[PDB]
Design a protein around this ligand. Sequence first.
Ligand code: CL
Ligand code: CL
Ligand code: CL
Ligand code: CL
Length: 99
Amino acid sequence: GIKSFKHKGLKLLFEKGVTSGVPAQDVDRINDRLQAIDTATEIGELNRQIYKLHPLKGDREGYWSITVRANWRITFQFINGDAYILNYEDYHKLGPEQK
Ligand SMILES: [Cl-]
Ligand SMILES: [Cl-]
Ligand SMILES: [Cl-]
Ligand SMILES: [Cl-]
């Protein structure tokens, strides 16, 4: 299950259905991916091809990334069947050394 959030917009959406902190047109896709992360019992279950699951590097080693749309990612730690530090971020703001 998802156990913590860094990004308040994702947290509001997941915990309360409040949509104001994510793009309106991405609400459904983000909800679908949050539910997938929440259901996953191992990082393999999130390995649907359309998600382009990627481990990050450097100070982001220990984080995983999946694609929402274009350059937008949901990132998280995944361990012992749970996900932590859920964030919504722009891939292009990661440095080359981080991905
Ligand atoms: Cl939290
Ligand atoms: Cl917010
Ligand atoms: Cl909150
Ligand atoms: Cl795993």
